[PDB]
């Protein structure tokens, strides 16, 4: 929250609140967008994925996240363009912060500023992340690695604390490694989904089956 | 600004060209800015397709 300094919340503590029929008075999240570059990009063309991870367990503010995304969206353009970056962020902010206001006071107090009826009102939407939990994620072509790591690097400045950058060993937004991705093409088990792969697999949820190979093929 | 976001230069707006046409109207001027009355408004009462 831009009112407060975020020192106030960069440690993952207090069991986690949410939007609900119970917490109605929340503001709207800062980021309401997780769409950076060419979303209509096939899975069989952008074989690289890089990831950014919070080194530290902590909260991660919505505003901060938003700020980060335009280190990967100004920097989308100067390097490569829209035909390299596909980002789903990979964290949202469900968690909320309260504010027991005593700003009331700037000269005296009414005493309601005190800890009677202490409980704060919703003010500041925010994410919670462990050390592994991933926070940015660019699926891309493998002629763009140093020109996307520097986006991630830039973003890292705009997160509290320590942030590790990495490249995985997969085609990005897939379980399956680059080694096991070529299998799919080869063995006739690649099934496209405009973004994802379903990957054709024999199984039985029927009575006597043979369309389980002949369905998607 | 939606239109601008498509982008084919900036025109019919505040520009390099509007430097010359910013507020040269008023050299004290005929009026404060522009006073005019019209009876072309209301298309239904006039009964026009124009």
């Amino acid at each position: 929250m831009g009112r407060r300094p975020a020192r106030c919340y960069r440690y993952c503590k207090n069991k986690p609140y949410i939007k609900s029929r119970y917490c109605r008075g929340v503001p709207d999240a800062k980021i309401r967008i997780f769409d950076l570059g060419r979303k209509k990009a096939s899975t069989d063309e952008f074989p690289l994925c890089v990831h950014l991870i919070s080194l530290e367990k902590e909260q991660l503010s919505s505003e901060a996240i938003e700020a980060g995304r335009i280190s990967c969206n100004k920097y989308i353009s100067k390097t490569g363009g829209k035909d390299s970056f596909h980002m789903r962020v990979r964290v949202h902010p469900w968690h909320v912060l309260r504010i027991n206001k005593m700003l009331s006071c700037a000269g005296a107090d009414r005493l309601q500023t005190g800890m009677r009826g202490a409980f704060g009102k919703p003010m500041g939407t925010v994410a919670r992340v462990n050390i592994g939990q991933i926070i940015f994620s660019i699926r891309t072509r493998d002629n763009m690695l140093a020109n996307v790591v520097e986006a991630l690097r830039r973003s890292s400045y705009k997160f509290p604390g320590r942030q590790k950058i990495v490249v995985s060993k997969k085609w990005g937004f897939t379980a399956y490694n680059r080694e096991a991705y070529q299998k799919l093409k080869a063995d006739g088990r690649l099934m496209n989904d405009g973004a994802n792969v379903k990957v054709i697999t024999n199984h039985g949820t029927l009575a006597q089956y043979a369309k389980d190979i002949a369905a998607a093929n | 600004e939606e239109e601008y976001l498509h982008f084919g230069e900036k025109a019919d707006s505040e520009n390099q060209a509007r430097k010359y046409m910013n507020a040269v109207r008023k050299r004290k001027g005929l009026y404060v800015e522009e006073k005019i009355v019209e009876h072309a408004e209301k298309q239904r009462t006039l009964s026009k397709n124009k």
Partner: protein
């Protein structure tokens, strides 16, 4: 005793106090001085920004928090945020000095602007200038008032400016159509009293007249008519900026 072991003290606020008396009960709120104006100017900056506190007081100066019965009775509701909002919209608002000055400044401009709408016409391409009038106003000195409307103020002060001297404003043609019998009578009284032009008496084709006013003195010209003959067959009203056909008066 006080003198020995703390002689005690009092404490002053620096927060705006938006106040409204409903049902003979003062409700007040906690806001800041340079936000409470900005709210009303269409700068929706979250309600939680303008409110320093979300609660209602009988008196926010001392700090007497307001009561549920009092609230519901006076507002038709006990929910406080809504009430606060209402107060912000409706009630008197304390302001700083700078803020106050801004309003005054605005008013000053306004009273010049209103004078500029219709100004002295040798042809119809000369003055219509706000600045000169404003300057004149400044240099003559008169109390600019927030209780007083702008138009009224202008009316008041133009007279003063007249004997500076400086000629101001231009007249327009508020046109009428009188009856055959009463029109003549009207003409008999209205010719030397005020300026009347485009007069053409007839037996069959009625009588047309054009009483001279700027729009801001249309009560005086009509009153006499009302007294004598009542309203005309048609009563033409034109705008208070231009006379519909270009001004040539004064």
């Amino acid at each position: 005793m006080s003198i020995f072991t703390p002689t005690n003290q009092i404490r002053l606020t620096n927060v705006a106090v938006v106040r409204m008396k409903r049902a003979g009960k003062r409700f007040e709120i906690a806001c800041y001085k340079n936000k409470v104006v900005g709210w009303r100017s269409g700068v929706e900056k979250d309600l939680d920004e303008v409110l320093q506190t979300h609660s209602v007081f009988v008196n926010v100066s001392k700090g007497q928090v307001a009561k549920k019965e009092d609230l519901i009775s006076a507002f038709g509701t006990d929910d406080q945020t809504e009430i606060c909002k209402q107060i912000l919209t409706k009630g008197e608002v304390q302001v700083s000095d700078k803020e106050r000055h801004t309003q005054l400044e605005q008013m000053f401009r306004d009273i010049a602007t209103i004078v500029a709408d219709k100004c002295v016409n040798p042809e119809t391409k000369r003055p219509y200038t706000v600045i000169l009038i404003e300057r004149a106003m400044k240099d003559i000195h008169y109390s600019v008032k927030t209780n007083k409307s702008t138009k009224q103020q202008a009316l008041e002060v133009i007279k003063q400016l007249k004997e500076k001297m400086k000629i101001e404003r231009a007249h327009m043609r508020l046109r009428f159509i009188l009856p055959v019998n009463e029109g003549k009578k009207l003409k008999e009284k209205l010719k030397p009293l005020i300026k009347v032009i485009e007069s053409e008496d007839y037996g069959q084709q009625l009588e047309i007249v054009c009483l001279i006013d700027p729009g801001c003195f249309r009560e005086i010209d009509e009153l006499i008519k009302k007294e004598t003959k009542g309203k005309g067959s048609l009563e033409v009203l034109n705008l208070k900026d231009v006379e519909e056909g270009d001004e040539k008066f004064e």
